[PDB]
Symmetry: C2
Subunit: 105 residues, 2 copies
């Protein structure tokens, strides 16, 4: 309904079933992208040139071409204590877990 | 309406109203991503760990959190001859123009 932005989402690992292997943390502030990517896209929309092109194409062909979508543009990692694929409990940074910024792609 | 994948698209510059500033090309093959991040039986959804976390959360709470989006994972550049600030034909390499591949983000 509204323009593309990041929304807050706590994820409990025991709800998703990741607590079989994740010892810490019990969950995390993963956040989620939502909102519209409508013409004209501003600097804050973190758009790609293709998202700007697709924006115009959808205006004239809304039946066949979708608008660009609101997806994470910057993801960060979280440090977690977990069971390895070698049966070892390790403290490693687990990539692409947290939304830092949203954008139109 | 269908499973996340890259689709073809030819963008004609006169149709988008850009024939005035882009001296060449007249258009190009931009492609677009479309489809639901449904994780089908005989397909490989390229997905970040966030998009996997968001999928799990969506399946357990569909009314609260939307599914991750079918966004471009790889984009490529195209070169264009455009009209300068001072009205002169200039060759510039336009980044993030062509969709090379799609995935769930
Ligand atoms: C288009 O894209 C941009 C770029 O991503 C985006 O704007 C970005 O907004 C985000 C927040 O939405 C900004 O993120 C914050 O930035 C600071 C920067 O910190 C510097 O200093 C320290 C110390 O060395 C370092 O951590 C860092 O390396 C920097 O040099 C961070 O301090 C913020 O961290 C907090 O939030 C994180 C998650 O985002 C947590 O992981 C973290 O532990 C921090 O928690 C604090 O705030 C939380 C709320 O976010 C809260 O949960 C806690 O209670 C706590 O108080 C954070 O990373 C980012 O830098 C912006 N970047 C720019 C370039 O402006 C735009 O929003 C986007 N467009 C759209 C449409 O979304
Ligand atoms: C997903 O896409 C990126 C960039 O196109 C690539 O580096 C990576 O190897 C891909 N992952 C899988 C599992 O196909």
């Amino acid at each position: 309904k509204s323009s593309c932005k990041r929304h807050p989402l706590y994820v409990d690992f025991s709800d998703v079933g990741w607590n079989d292997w994740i010892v810490a943390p019990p969950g995390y502030h993963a956040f989620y992208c939502d909102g519209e990517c409508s013409f004209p896209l501003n600097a804050h929309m973190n758009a790609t040139n293709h998202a700007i092109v697709q924006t115009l194409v959808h205006l004239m062909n809304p039946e066949y071409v979708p608008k660009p979508c609101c997806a994470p543009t910057e993801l960060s990692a979280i440090s977690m204590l977990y069971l390895d694929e070698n049966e070892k409990v390790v403290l490693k940074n687990y990539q692409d877990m947290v939304v830092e910024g949203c954008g139109c792609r």
